[PDB]
Ligand code: CLA
């Protein structure tokens with residue numbers, strides 16, 4: 001077990017066992033039954049892995065935007081910029097997004113139920129590559145860099161993934177009361193820290209004391 | 212004899228252990244009982260065989276340029292006579308409804324009085340004069356072809372109906388919209404198929 | 409709009425009802441002096457009344473011929489015509505609170521019954537335990553489906569029957 | 572004219588006999604119980620249908636039941 | 652004191668503290684953001 | 692020994708009883724040929740206020 005989210009005396013009951021990114025953080029005891037703890041673990045990954053690849057489109061691009069290299073729009077209004085384009089792809093995108101994910105995800109849903117269960121003649125000829133080593137960590141998807149014996153580079157995958165999940169929650173909240181992008185919000189806290197915060201300007205609290 | 216799996220890795224269903232067209236499908240356990248399965252297996256082949264003929268019909272009218280499958284019975288309200296390859300068949304509406312009922316009632320009734328469970332699905336003799344069923348291998352193989360092709364006709368005859376209601380266009384015209392501009396001309400862009408588009 | 413109802417902003421009776429309810433206070437305000445406390449109390453009520461009417465109009469409510477706002481319940485019409493906060497969203501708010509009360513009381517009942525003298529624990533509560541469960545019930549839906557999918561929610565024919 | 576029937580579950584407590592005022596219940600020996608006693612109802616003609624006896628019975632369900640029925644002068648408790 | 656805390660853990664007293672909380676919370680929720688009907 | 696063991700829990704099967712499909716401790720068992728020997732004690736009271744009752748061999752079964 002890795003260090004404790006409280007340094008002091010918060011005894012966990014079922015997290016002493018091995019697992020990735022185990023810091024003993026389960027007050028509500030939602031991981032008591034092991035069968036559904038096994039399910040929530042994969043949820044942290046798909047949310048972790050998806051959130052990180054999403055945060056780059058908000059982050060890697062807006063940094064280049066504030067510097068002035070590109071004139072792309074902000075994420076809070078990128079959706080209304082696509083469909084008015086002459087060469088556009090109007091909303092058959094919601095449904096095709098579901099028809100495409102529905103094929104992959106149920107293949108992932110039936111793996112957690114029956115691990116390594118991809119029949120011999122079910123797919124054309126690549127039935128062997130689709131078998132996975134463990135749940136959440138398949139083999140033939142990564143081309144290099146998964147043959148070490150100390151496999152816990154996974155801890156980087158989680159600490160980076162949990163962090164990004166905070167980012168989008170902050171992007172969405174910052175972009176609902178500040179009215180500006182995430183990086184524009186950063187340039188202000190650096191230029192005038194004490195004035196631009198969640199307390200006084202960002203109306204997250206009813207503070208009206210003009211005296 | 213399992214042709215495949217609709218869901219690879221799914222749990223086997225013992226009620227469908229050895230039949231033609233088995234894919235281990237049934238997720239609602241319809242067919243758990245042994246007697247009802249013999250009825251469903253009869254209903255599937257007949258819902259099949261009626262769809263395959265009716266499906267080739269709708270294509271035959273449009274491929275040969277005769278008209279729509281939807282506008283075929285519209286002569287009755289207008290009053291003009293029906294046609295088959297523009298031959299002007301003379302019979303009237305009350306004559307069609309009388310001969311159809313008496314003819315099909317004689318046919319369907321004789322079918323139900325068979326009481327031979329294998330022949331209720333796969334008769335012999337007169338219904339197969341050329342004798343393809345004599346070879347057990349090709350017979351077993353051709354049964355999977357009867358059923359695979361039939362399930363296409365059923366799901367797709369429903370498409371001829373659903374396509375028509377949302378868009379009044381005919382079959383081959385509605386296909387041309389996909390090929391001309393797929394991403395724009397789809398069921399999503401009908402405005403009726405999906406609420407909220 | 410829908411169901412032959414006008415919005416409250418465009419209605420005449422809605423504004424008629426505002427001019428009436430303010431006229432009652434203005435007549436009542438004439439009796440007292442400007443700087444007195446009864447004057448300050450009525451002016452505040454006047455300020456609240458003016459705020460109640462404009463906020464209900466701003467919220468896209470629907471007022472009928474009588475001039476009073478009406479609510480819509482079908483989520484389809486609510487979402488289509490932007491009236492979801494009225495009924496459809498109040499339903500989820502209450503269910504989360506109602507479930508929280510159930511998941512808490514159910515757990516206190518089960519845990520006290522695992523010990524000696526559970527009858528005393530009902531009339532004389534274990535407040536440290538009750539507060540512990542009351543602050544652990546924020547994610548009550550997760551535990552329910554966890555307990556349903558597991559099968560430890562329901563009892564199985566170990567219950568008393570009558571015949 | 573009420574009916575008083577006692578069932579197989581009696582244990583010889585005698586609490587039914589002590590309770591009913593009108594002396595309609597007495598104890599008789601029997602081989603079924605530890606106490607070797609059983610009740611009886613010889614004189615139900617004097618039963619006022621008070622039903623105090625059933626209350627005395629301390630079994631899971633009553634081994635003594637007073638099935639009310641046709642009334643009479645003695646049953647209605649009429650001094651007149 | 653052990654018996655005093657036990658008296659405070661009775662049903663009549665714990666209910667009194669509950670009532671002051673729920674009623675105090677609702678009245679305070681009506682005093683600020685006055686008279687709500689539609690939820691935004 | 693004729694019947695269940697002392698201190699053993701058992702489940703009741705009298706349809707008439709307040710304790711039907713419920714569990715109780717066996718207080719004692721008599722081996723003298725009595726029809727209803729098995730004495731059982733429950734925590735919950737009945738409607739009258741009694742928490743014990745003599746049951747039979749066939750009327751009781753193993754727990755749960
Ligand atoms: C976790 C990452 C994260 C980061 C780095 C920021 C950063 C910022 N937020 Mg923000 N925010 C976040 C998450 C985050 N937020 C989330 C999850 C929410 C929703 C609850 C919000 C809601 C929010 C509002 C409503 C507002 C901001 C604002 C701001 C800016 C000014 C500071 C402030 O108001 O205090 C931040 C206040 C908080 C309550 C969040 C702090 C708590 C986090 C979780 C602690 C994390 C620890 C540490 C900082 C991590 C280091 C990471 C770093 C090395 C990259 C600043 C750029 C203000 C603005 O207008 O920007 C100009 C503003 O009005 N935030």
Ligand code: CLA
Nearest residue numbers: 260263267270271333334335338339343344353354356357
């Ligand atoms: C492709 C579909 C198909 C297939 C593979 C079969 C296969 C079979 N049927 Mg079956 N059948 C079908 C459709 C089909 N049937 C339909 C639609 C009906 C209703 C009329 C029947 C009615 C029927 C009966 C009553 C019996 C069978 C029997 C049999 C078996 C022996 C005969 C044989 O080998 O058929 C071989 C089939 C072919 C070689 C296909 C011929 C292709 C034709 C000529 C196409 C004509 C249509 C035209 C091109 C469409 C126009 C298109 C338009 C756009 C213009 C075998 C399992 C018998 C049985 O059970 O065996 C013991 C039996 O008694 N069938």
Ligand code: CLA
Nearest residue numbers: 509510511512513514515516517533534537538539541542
């Ligand atoms: C944890 C306590 C608890 C729980 C989980 C339930 C749960 C349930 N009750 Mg119920 N009930 C309770 C207490 C509880 N009840 C009490 C105290 C009474 C006496 C007033 C009743 C009287 C009652 C009746 C008459 C009926 C139900 C019914 C039901 C079922 C439908 C819900 C309903 O409408 O009930 C009704 C809800 C109430 C009457 C409100 C109960 C009073 C408060 C809000 C709940 C008590 C919480 C507790 C005091 C807090 C302790 C927490 C602890 C940490 C200290 C449901 C499974 C119905 C049913 O039979 O289902 C089909 C039904 O007809 N209950």
Ligand code: CLA
Nearest residue numbers: 530531532658659661662663664665666667668669670671
């Ligand atoms: C001083 C006067 C006084 C008054 C007016 C009451 C009144 C009450 N007592 Mg009581 N009590 C008193 C003195 C008093 N007590 C004294 C001197 C003692 C000795 C220490 C006790 C010990 C005692 C015990 C042990 C119990 C009560 C209980 C009760 C309640 C009866 C249960 C019920 O009907 O609701 C039924 C409740 C439900 C069906 C569901 C719960 C929802 C409730 C109504 C919410 C809580 C209400 C809250 C207490 C009201 C505020 C207090 C009110 C008097 C202002 C009732 C409100 C019983 C109780 O449970 O209290 C609630 C109970 O077990 N009292």
Ligand SMILES: CC1=C[C@H](O)CC(C)(C)[C@@H]1/C=C/C(C)=C\C=C/C(C)=C\C=C/C=C(C)\C=C/C=C(C)\C=C/C1=C(C)C[C@H](O)CC1(C)C
Nearest residue numbers: 052053055056142143160163164166167170182183185186
């Ligand atoms: C709040 C806020 C506000 C303001 O305004 C701003 C700021 C300051 C920014 C803040 C925030 C922060 C955060 C939270 C976050 C960020 C970032 C991250 C975490 C991530 C990315 C990003 C992440 C990520 C993961 C991405 C990428 C990665 C990867 C691996 C991919 C791919 C791959 C894989 C799969 C495997 C193979 O074999 C290989 C490859 C192909 C190579």
Ligand SMILES: CC1=C[C@H](O)CC(C)(C)[C@@H]1/C=C/C(C)=C\C=C/C(C)=C\C=C/C=C(C)\C=C/C=C(C)\C=C/C1=C(C)C[C@H](O)CC1(C)C
Nearest residue numbers: 263264266267270339340341360363364367368370382383
């Ligand atoms: C989806 C879609 C949509 C869009 O719109 C369009 C499109 C693209 C085209 C598509 C459609 C499709 C469909 C519906 C149909 C087609 C086909 C089929 C299925 C059938 C026919 C067709 C089928 C069929 C079966 C027919 C025929 C066959 C047969 C066998 C008959 C008779 C016979 C038999 C008895 C046996 C003997 O020994 C011989 C003979 C005498 C010769």
Ligand code: SF4
Nearest residue numbers: 581582583584585587
């Ligand atoms: S009161 Fe019941 S248990 Fe007692 S002696 Fe009479 S019949 Fe037997």
Ligand code: SF4
Nearest residue numbers: 591620621622623624
């Ligand atoms: S009915 Fe009354 S008087 Fe008669 S036996 Fe019972 S308790 Fe005694």
